[model samples]
Target chain A: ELPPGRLATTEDYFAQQAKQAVTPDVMAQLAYMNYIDFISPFYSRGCSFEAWELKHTPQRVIKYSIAFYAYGLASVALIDPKLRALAGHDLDIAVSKMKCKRVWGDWEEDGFGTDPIEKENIMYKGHLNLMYGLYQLVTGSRRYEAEHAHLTRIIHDEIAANPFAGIVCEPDNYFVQCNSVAYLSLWVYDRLHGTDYRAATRAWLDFIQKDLIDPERGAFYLSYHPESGAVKPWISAYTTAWTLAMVHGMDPAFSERYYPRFKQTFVEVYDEGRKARVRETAGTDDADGGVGLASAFTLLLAREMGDQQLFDQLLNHLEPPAKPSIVSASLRYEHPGSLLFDELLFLAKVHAGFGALLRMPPP
Target chain B: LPPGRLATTEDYFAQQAKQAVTPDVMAQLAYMNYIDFISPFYSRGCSFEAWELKHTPQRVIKYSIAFYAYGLASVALIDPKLRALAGHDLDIAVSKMKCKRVWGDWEEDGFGTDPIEKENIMYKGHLNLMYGLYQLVTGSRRYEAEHAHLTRIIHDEIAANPFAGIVCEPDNYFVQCNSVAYLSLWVYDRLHGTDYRAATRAWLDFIQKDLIDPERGAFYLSYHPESGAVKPWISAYTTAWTLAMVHGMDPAFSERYYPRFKQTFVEVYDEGRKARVRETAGTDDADGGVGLASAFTLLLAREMGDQQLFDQLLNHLEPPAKPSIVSASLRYEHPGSLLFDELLFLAKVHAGFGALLRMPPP
Candidate 1:
């Protein structure tokens, strides 16, 4: 079931996602999922990431680029090599906009007022650097080598300087998802530069395992106090799935180690294991996603975790039993026109689950 | 400056709102504000206060005609008997709204050859909705082309930014104003065979995502799309106006949001079972509600059927009974501008069918 050496493929995922990129039959299911019309907005110049989510909380902007990168990369990796140029082009615009002062509003909210170019935006710096690594990966060119090293340098320093010596996404109440990416980004940066910087994360990995995970329940802590180091217990449905996907790259054993407990606590299974949904303690609405986040990502993480039975049950809940109000492959709603980030992530989850995202070579 | 005690009779407010827009008062707003005795609002100090005239970006003329029309239309809906009378006065009122003086305030900022030809959502937005109301209530099509022209023009200007929609003026973007513009787009579809459901849904979806104020889960007062900046000011429409406006088109969305709105803005004050709309008049500290927020909010809170706040506002705002002196001289003595007229009209208009407002069997 776990095809370790091959790329992920899908069960009609592209039928709904990219009709132009693929041909037909498979596309019908995507129309039902509200998965097709993203093609309408994503390519439009007016559809800025901050458009739906007016706050340029670059989290959304960055997610737009990364999720597409996953789609484009997976397409190029297995489906169509021509999409190679598309991802490169899309990334160039998103990267430059991310550098603008307007997108820096989140950094200032964490009280790092003076300049965004100055460090400490680990949430931003980490994700952006990871994106740059993809630009290197898909295009097979380091067109961004100059800034990538500069941003990597900033992220490397901030991780060591902070209180728990961990990254603060908002510069307070540090996040495990953010910390995972900071080092995971470092691992990619090292792969590209021939630098050994990935070695620096050895202790932080252990720190998260020992301090961040709730020992009794074996659930990952989503956030924690820097001063007190008191962890926020259990995990949000979205964060649980996201962190597992990321940390799998650095230490697959740890990601594998946490799977049983992650499922035990988060997955609410029923109907003799034919139905399931992720149960979150809080934050269904934080980070540009809500119930939709867990609703999508749990499938991707389960696929990566090699749980066929669990993945099958979770996947069953993705569609309504009875459906309509669709117009020949038009995007519909589960909170329509809202939850764009989660919508984009659902596409990524499907693509990645089929062996599209991870295990790709260095950029 | 208080009204002392409450006079809560529906007939008292009906007559007051009815009296607020008498043929004489309607002509006063139409003539005194527009033909300006002649230079721009013709710079009239009549009916408007010295403070109102002193304020820049002149909005009094704009708000007065529009709200006066809104108030009358609202009252007409509440009581079907007043329909023709309200319709007659609004004909005079909307004719004035159609003139350059009411909607063309954007001329100072500069645009295409004629403002109606280009980017003026404020002028075009209100004019269209006003036209729709005039036609809807009076069972007439007098402003028919006028409504069609406004929506056709708006479709072009706002078609660009699917995120924030169009600006109220050159560099300024207001969620309140655009929400009004969206209503016109919706009304346009209902009137004609055109479909702007896509436009309305996209803009609304964008607002729900982008414009929400995190602290209160309300919308920002204004957004500067050029710089991607937002002012966290939640005003009258930010809560109640949006609730009432969007309720007709997207009932499920607004109905779900109304409880959260009440939780955030409605509160019990004085331990007297008196519920006051938050940000009443002015409270500068939080930069919440600015001006006319209280009056407009009270009308809409009633419009949305929050009887608790409506009665409280009615109790707090009903005009005190001074001797009529004479019918012609009968008006509340508050500010020297259209402000008093607006407040009096809202109270009068308060006596109407909120969601119960019916149309021509649509």
Candidate 2:
């Protein structure tokens, strides 16, 4: 059931509850799912984001920080207040690096090129501004605005000047997910500054629903043509789940309206021995699909849509049935490594707070 | 201009010095071009090739010794008279080896060094070939003790770990390791007069039966050591080295695999004045395999006595023409230097292992 109207008592109560939930038994179950260890390693120095991104992609660095902020925020909202410090520390270093460094090799921009407004660059700045605003509203502090005021100004102006006004171009085609974030980013700015961007948010969604979503199947296209509005007809499970989670924030009624059709088209049966699970699609694996964390988004959507059956099924999938490779309370991978999938898993679990946090604070 | 014959013994041995001439100069230049400037102390580890497989202990040991062996033997091939001169160069290399932590202890753990028992026979086998070649050519007993010492270790190493008849490297990424293992055993047999031919024949059979792709008529990049599932990745570079090692031992073996080798050539060869092969897309460009792949193909062609293929490959295989600032005789590619390229330059110039040791014995 939804716990609302008890922010102080609810936050403390869940903190007490999470202490019991993180014990040896539940930690082992989480480890078997590769869930606990995946999210555990947040403490490290300076900006590994640049080096890590260079190894993976620049997109990964941005998504990971956004994911980390979400994880920290969710932990603060639900489990522990201490994690906010970790998130803030990590964000400060990440923001500093993003501000100072020029684009290097391994990214699209060639040798010492001037920074262009890429999806990853805008997404991170927006996510940070959104995160800091949420941090201030939740914790009752005005400290972040002064420290990051310049960055906020850049984000606000960039979002305003964006030609499509939240629609951005990727390498090959345009992403609706990128467009969705742009809208959410504006909404975060509006919530923080008391600016009325409700019409802008409504207009963006109206465009997404009418133009972006395939009316027949409720499936979102992977990419779109800018001028023509023609779509790349590929239906990715990851994208479907991502759009569902994001849209719930702006328009819960629309998200609830699309749920049955979206579930029927996107969700595929996954059975590994005793455990029953639902996958995003029966389609071939894509490296960037964020499959590992897609289930988490689905679970959050299930809860938001108030579908108890789907939520329980997803919770069972997350808990998993098998024994963990690590028997101890340390809750680590037998072989220590983390992939983008792992970060998605963390972000998906933490993303639940978005619905409540982004809910209008009342007239 | 080619310096085929010298009237005096002074000229002949000095020809030996001239052969030594190219290797040392290129080695110096290659040392200067460390592509990844990540560290202050340029110690060998994971980041060897700017972003390839990192800290492969086996690769470091294998390539390092192969580089030294090829350099020393190139010097030795100039004249039999300058044998001790080459031996002196080898001694300096081996002394440097003893001081390095990876070399001295040889303690094997977690894809690192494994000493004596349960070792990667492939690594042991190549080590034997390198050390055994040094001993055989120089007529020095300095490495002779370890030469016998390693030969016995390789024998046990092979017997203990053969997947079917062939020894595989870790993760089954290379079935080509079997080729070097056979070459080491063949070199050991030649030096010591031990009967390793039966085991060598068995390995040859295993490779031909298990590894070769019948449709493509070439060896796949890797095979599952346990399951023998063929990986789609085909490498002309590793296959070329395998052919040379086998060809060095038995002319017949080269004859058998020649078709597959020829097939691999067509797949990888890039056409230009300075011809090269692509190692893989995004991972390696033309330069990675151009020198080594072409050099080894030329060596194989010469061994199989296919003058047509030999001449064809030879036309395509041009040594780096850019003169090294260190020495006029030694030329390398201008922009960057790879150690594999430098070693293969010697191999290409001399025509296969002929640069290492020309004749068997008196």
Candidate 3:
């Protein structure tokens, strides 16, 4: 089903395309998410990670950023010549915050002590975080060429690897975050190396299937003890989407090679999801929009695969059931005034992206 | 010296020989001896002995008499003979004790002067000054007239002035002494219908809260006499007073303040009961002397109100619960030897309260 060695023409494809980007729809959903009204008041001189969380909610950043990046990258890769323009701007904002450029490293970088730096920032994942940031920076502003070069050094040196050491996986749940960062770095590495980093990326993708993918359940385990071989059942749809996009976009040959296994995992997840009847709000509370976004990614990947049956599943998930608690319950009992922004963001994304995707099936 | 029993022929002599049990000369001399001791040095250095001095680090020596007077006076009032004795001698004792007592009395040229200073007698006892007035009035003691006057002086010179109040100018830890005086006066007014002391009583009561715990039942050890905030050096006796006095006066008030009181007293009684009660009847161990000892006695008498238990205590303490070690009084010991008024008070407690004790509600 996978097309290989295809010379794609953006102009010709657009004429035949079923769906077109609708800025107004996306903007309306963004407004309903209250991105401007909710967040602007809290923005003052210095920006701390906590301040960001407090003012705009961490889930919103994770939600919007991942959405823009996945779409932006896919848009760039599919177009063959130019990077996705609008998606790039949003992705840049999200990625810039990840790589110590905005409240990243120092505990006091933002509002200081009140906002803690991410723990993994000092760890090896930091290099991957930088790669994502560099991709956003280079693609969006394209101003920091030297910074992108620096990010590339770290991505290739630290993150791009086969059987990816420290990359945790299980049969039931996938370590979306750890491996996602790894995939992000590998994607950057392959893009930078052209065809050079292909073999390693393919090897990692294989390991992701053998180690992380639950064939029976059709979902990735969040993590498994490499030593214990025990798997957890928490799945992040966003992780699955990012994983599929990076592998398929960077090198379709690898995607075609891993297609059956990936399809098997996706099918199992789709089937289980059919039985479970998950409420759309399940992923709303999630900051990464991991669950909700995972469903979206699965649909996007299925479209990329051009699998008619799986594409049907994508359409249903895109039109999610109504959000749980049309009104959000505050996590902080004291601050009932503060909205549960994660749930709101999830609503925004599902309502925004899927509404657009539903207009015309990916085919 | 002895009131010899009349022989069988005495009836023939028309009446029993009127023996001079306390000769006029002896009474006069005894009165003279008491005047000499005024200086604190002449007396054992302590609050319990100072009469005016209390709440200091030194222990209150004349223990139990405060409670003893209440208990004894009740007994004396019930019996005609005892009542007469209380009316005459006990009354005389109160009057004499007040005027004649001071730190030391060397100028008097009497050996009764505080032997230590060769100047003044330790003209004090916790019971004689504060509680004696109450006991006499209740038991119909002789100097019942002087009762109000003496109590007035104590309230003014030692209490109301704050500077002269018990612990002197620093006014540290005066809660123990001053609080006792206020509660005793309240008790006195209730017992004798002397309601006029209420205003002074009310003022002191208001000012005293500065020493008491706002949130709890018990009070701090001391207060900054002026500001009335709880200062350091709080003790069990202080808590004991709050529990006993507040509950005794108003059960409703007790309930209001009970939670904190319970917390504080539970801690107090646990520590007090857990530690072995040490014996220090003699050697003038001031801590083992009157005030603290009286406070301890009051703690029990006030809570249990068991006149039977109180009487049983009288059996051991009547001749005075002498310390195992020394002849002189320590501030913290149960009163022994100096049982004149104390014994009467215990007997009165036994006869009056009997077994139907209504311990202060709090």
**Model 2 CA deviation exceeding 4 Å by range:** A1-54, A57-258, A261-363, B1-61, B95-109, B112-116, B162-173, B214-217, B267-275, B278-292, B298-321, B325-337, B349-362
Off by over 4 Å in 1: A1-41, A44-79, A100-102, A282-292, A321-330, A334-345, A353-363, B1-362
List, residue by residue over A1-363, the lDDT tens digit for candidate 2: 322211122232223434623223322322222111012222222222323443353443544444444433443343334333333433333333343333222234433224434433443444555555555544444656774456555655655665554535443355766556656655665677787654567656776666667756667776667667577766655577667767778887877777788777655444443222444444643222433445655655665465655655554555332222333222222321224433443343434445565652421
Per-residue lDDT of candidate 1, residues B1-362 (tens digit): 23433234344345433544344334333433343344123332233332244342244566666666776676565556657766776676676665554444454323443657755666667777778777777768877876776777788776766464777545456666776778777666666668864687777777786576434535654555533444323444455666666666677766677676666665556564455455411232211223344555566665565656666654544443231323333334343223544555554454433232345521
True interface contacts reproduced, per candidate: 0.00, 0.00, 0.00
lDDT tens string, model 3, A1-363? 212221222222232222443223233332323234435311222232443455454432333343333343333322322224433443454444444434333323212232222222222343334335434433534554555555445445543432343342211112544454445554454454353533455555566667576545444544443322333323434455545544555456645565565454333334444311121111122222212344455544555555545544443433333221222311111222223333322222222221122121121
Q: What is the docking quality class of candidate 2?
A: incorrect
What's the true lDDT of residue A71 in model 3?
A: 41
Deviation from native of the Cα of residue B256 in model 1, angstroms? 56
Decreasing DockQ order of the candidates: 1, 2, 3
Worst 10 residues of 1 chain A by lDDT: A29-38
| Highest lDDT model number | 1
lDDT tens digits by residue: candidate 3, B215-288:
64545555555565565433444555444444444445545554544443332223232111111322322224
TM values, all candidates = 0.44, 0.45, 0.33
